[PDB]
Structure 1
């Protein structure tokens, strides 16, 4: 009730009652907000509303001060002052961008652009507002009731009439009813219960909507440059394996925070784990937004770090299966691996935040609020996939607008850049280096002569809105009969419906481009499926082709990306 202005920090009893987050506003900023937007409800201890009985005047521009009470133009006493006048709204202790964040629906790319170009406090107001909007939007959907249960990984659902049906993919995690979280995939659909329970007919599901907590800490702490490695104690017995990263681990101790751009297979996990061998006495908290990203840090630490000082923090509401080799929930072990949502209230000598393109500004702020560290390291790549923006339907979100860290990496450049790709055949490295890394990524492997491209538009069908291209899967089927070594390939496509069809027709294991991020496979078979802005996204294309160690087959729809692929072309 007695707070600080989310724009100029001036203390005030004023708050905007029309803002979903009800931000505290000072007299100067409250005025400029109410006179420029549809937001006219001002709240303090008592709201600014006509105190005359039965009067429904809540607009602060149509209200006055009747001694110590508030009344409209039709009820005010002779001696009464307008609440709104002289560039201020009457309050104790007597912006174009704030207005846009406050009133937008978050469906345009320009909303997210502003949420990252604004001041630091407006980045937090934007991140809070956006998340509150995303959760409340979930409430507006239709309930799925289990009509029948065929088998253990198959069922038929009945949907609510008059309310939209959400897209069935592991993107949307439904809460079953209180029989745990479940997911769906294609009238034969597949049910995926995080908690195993004999699929009860009649029992319904409802979308997971969690409470948006206020943000206190900034997305990025104020940068500090030090003259010497501060609060960290390095070794002289640094193993040759991590010798290449020594000069950068030193940079990490001479800065409050540091950014690392690591293209696919340049050694991000290796760099993060090697930083623990360089500052061996330092307590390191390893974080990321996904469980799979934290598990990739756990797999790398298992090899170089002592398994006794390692703890994988698992939230009590254990959703899907994760890393099982460290002592679970020991917050005090020297190395703590944990997702951002599960981060306990603790301190560290170094905090390593991996897969930074997947972080939102809400996540950047949570980390600064739960972990007080001497040094913060942000590892990732703005040329890879960002976190899905469910409300965004108009415009394309650029990497410099994913979050504060990506904005920095794309504007002033990253502090550190891992320039040599050790995973991919040179054909893949040469293609993505020119596409998203302005020729700064270098190939370590030779050309494998196992990277192929085929131009085939096929036939695009649609399962609600996820696309299928059966003739492209047919081309893969014909390729596999001629190249049976490719039987050990992972099938990748931008759509789960294409993946669902290819799983039944080819029998290859399946992965969408988005779920393949961070993983590597000897052979990849990619069917673009469509030429949409989704399937043509350069970050998604980059992730797709950089999953392969040995060979890749790309069946393309877009002439542009097909011509850009530095692969052997195949006929048929």
Structure 2
């Protein structure tokens, strides 16, 4: 009840009753808020409501102080002062951006731009408000009750009438009824249960609406620059393998936090694990939002770091299969690998946060609250994919607005840049270098002469809204017959429904662009499927074509991106 103002820290008994997070607002700032927004309910120990019996006046601008109580204009005593006067709301201890964050529905991109260009306390208010809004939106969706169980991987669902049906992709994880978390993929549907249970007919599934906790720590700690390496003890005998990053590892010890921009295959995991070999006494906590990103850091550590000093932290509510080679849940080991949402409350000499474009400001703040470190290293690439913003439907979110770290990398530049792509054939490196890296990404490999492009719009069908292009899959089928080496290719597309159709017709393993991020394959077959802003997104395009080590086949819909591909064009 007695707290600090979210805009100027000035201690106050006032909280806005109309804000979903009920932020503490000082006398001067609370006024500026209520007089310029639909928000008029003000809270204290006792709320600002007319005390006269059965009176429903709750608007602070229509209320007054009758000695030590509150009444409206109809019930106030003769000796009464308005609660709103002289730019203040009467309270104990006597913003255009705050108003927009407090009242927006988070469906426009301009809302996310503001949530990242505002002050640090407003980045936290925006992050809790958004996450709480995203949670109440899960309640709007309809329940799915099991109508029939066909086999061990297929079932038929009955949906709730009057309430919308949530998108059926791996992005939406339901909580089954607690018969474990489950996911669905498209009258025959495919059921993927985290726990193996003999699907009961009648058992219902409801979305994982979790409670949004308040944020205390900033998204980024205030930057500190040092004259020498602080609290970290380096080696002189540092393996030749990691010699390329020695100046960069030293920059890490001479700053509180550092940003590393690493385009695809430039050595991000190698840099992250090599930092442990450079400061061999340093206790390092490796974190990322996804289990896949944490597991990819575990695979690199398994090769260079002693296995007895590693531990993979697994939340007691084990969602998916992850890394099994380190001792599980030993928080005290020198090397701790854990997803952000499972981080224990501990300290470290270095905290490494990978896949930084997938972090939200909420995740950035949680890491600063659960981990107190001498150094923080943020690794990722603002030219790769961001975290999905389920509420955002109007506008495109630019990389400088993904999070605070991405904002820094796109404005003031990253502290460190890994400039040599060692994964991709030169045709792919030269294409993305020009597209998203301002020609600063260099190719280590030669041109493979296995990178093809085909301009073919096909026919766009839809499974609700997820798109399908059967003629583009028909072109791939015709190509596979003529190019049997491509039998081992991974099929990639911007749509789950396109992938479902290609899995049956081609038999190739499938991956969406978003689920392919961080992974690499010898051959990639990409079908653009549509000409939407989603399938044309340059960050998504960049991720899609940089998955390939040897060859890529792109069946394109957009002329712009087709013309930019520095690939050999094919006919049909």
TM-score, length-normalised on structure 1?
Answer: 1.00
Alpha-carbon offset, residue 186 of structure 1 = 1.0
Measure, in 2, the Cα distance between the counterparts of 1:186 and 1:471: 19
Residues in 2 aligned to 1:531 and 1:359: alpha-carbon distance in whole angstroms = 27
- SS of residue matched to 2:220: coil
Note the alpha carbon deviations across 1:58-103, whole angstroms, 9 max, x for none: 0000000000000000000000000001100000000000000000
Residue aligning to 1:250: 250
Runs (4+) of structure 1 exceeding 4 A deviation are none
- Write the distance in 1 (CA, Å) between the matches of 2:521 and 2:52: 72
Shift of 1:148: 0.2
Instruction: Return the offset for 1:22.
Output: 0.2
Post-superposition shift, 1:324? Answer: 0.2
The secondary structure found in structure 2 opposite 1:453 is strand
Structure 2: gaps of 5 or more residues: none
Deviation track 1:525-570 (CA, whole Å, cap 9, x = no partner) reads 0000000000000000000000000000000000000000000000
C-alpha deviations, 1:392-422, integer Å up to 9, x for none? 0000000000000000000000000000000
Question: Per-residue deviation at 1:145?
Answer: 0.5
Residue by residue, what CA displacement relative to the aligned partner does 1:278-327 show, whole Å, maximum 9, x if unpaired?
A: 00000000000000000000000000000000000000000010000000
Q: Distance in 1 between the 2:189 and 2:300 partners? A: 36
Give a deviation string over 1:372-409, Cα, whole Å, max 9, x none: 00000000000000000000000000000000000000
Aligned counterparts of 1:172 and 1:246: Cα–Cα separation in 2: 42
Give 3-state SS (helix, strand or coil) of 1:311's partner.
Answer: strand
Task: State how far apart, in whole Å, the 2-side matches of 1:166 and 1:118 are.
Answer: 32
Distance of 2:56 and 2:325 partners within structure 1: 63
Give the whole-Å Cα distance in 2 for the aligned partners of 1:228 and 1:412.
23
- CA shift for structure 1 position 330: 0.0
SS state at 1:151 partner: coil
> What's 1:228 paired with?
228
SS in 1 for 2:307: coil
Matches of 1:418 and 1:48, distance apart in 2: 57
Tell me the equivalent position of 2:326. Answer: 326
C-alpha distance after superposition, 1:102-121 (max 9, x if no partner):
00000000000000000000
C-alpha distance in 1 between matches for 2:556 and 2:312: 41
For residues 154-210 of structure 1, what are the alpha-carbon distances to aligned partners after superposition, in whole Å with 9 as ceiling and x for unaligned? 000000000000010000000000101000001000000001100110000000111
Tell me the SS of whatever aligns to 1:378: strand
Give the distance between the partners of 1:220 and 1:482, measured in 2 at CA.
53
Shift of 1:441: 0.2
CA distance in 2: counterparts of 1:66 and 1:136, whole angstroms: 38
The SS at the match of 1:76 is coil
Distance 2:421 2:187 in 1: 44
Give CA-to-partner distance per residue, 1:233-252, whole Å, 9 cap, x none: 00011000000000000000
Does residue 350 (structure 1) correspond to residue 343 (structure 2)? The answer is no
SS at match of 1:57: coil
Return the offset for 1:334.
Answer: 0.0
Structure 1 counterpart SS, 2:165: coil
TM-score of the superposition, structure 2-length normalised?
Answer: 1.00
Residue aligning to 1:401:
401
The CA distance in 1 between the partners of 2:440 and 2:178, in whole Å, is: 52
Structure 2 equivalent of residue 472 of structure 1: 472
Secondary structure of the 1:200 match is: coil
What do residues 431-466 of structure 1 show as CA deviations (whole Å, max 9, x unaligned)?
000000000000000000000000000000000000
Question: Aligned with 2:379: secondary structure?
Answer: strand
Q: Quote the residue 1:237 is aligned against.
A: 237
Tell me the distance in 1 between the aligned counterparts of 2:276 and 2:33: 49
Paired residue secondary structure (2:308):
coil
Q: Distance in 2 between matches of 1:141 and 1:308?
A: 46
RMSD: 0.2
Task: Give the length in aligned residue pairs.
Answer: 572
Q: Please state whether the residue corresponding to 2:550 is helix, strand or coil.
A: strand
The alpha carbon displacement at 1:262 in A equals 0.1
Gaps of 5+ in 1: none
> How far apart are the structure 1 equivalents of 2:103 and 2:495?
33
Q: CA deviation at 1:474?
A: 0.1
How many Å separate the matches in 2 of 1:146 and 1:237?
62
- Structure 1 distance, partners of 2:512, 2:412, is 32
Aligned to 1:363: 363
- For residues 107 and 416 of structure 1, the distance between their equivalents in structure 2, rounded to whole angstroms, comes to 34
Deviation at 1:494, TM superposition (A): 0.1
Residue correspondence of structure 1 range 58-207 to structure 2 within 5 A? 58-207=58-207
Aligned to 2:453: 453
SS at match of 2:324: coil
Q: 1:263-285 CA distances to partner (integer Å, 9 max, x unpaired)?
A: 00000000000000000000000
- Mapped partners of 2:21, 2:138: distance in 1: 17
- SS of the residue aligned with 1:308? helix
1:35-77 deviations in Å (ceiling 9; x for gaps): 0000000000100000000000000000000000000000000
SS at structure 1 position matched to 2:52 = coil
CA–CA distance in structure 1, aligned partners of residues 518 and 187 of structure 2:
33
Per-residue CA deviations over 1:484-511 (Å, capped at 9, x if unaligned) read: 1100000000000000000000000000
Whole-Å separation in 1 of the counterparts to 2:124 and 2:204: 36
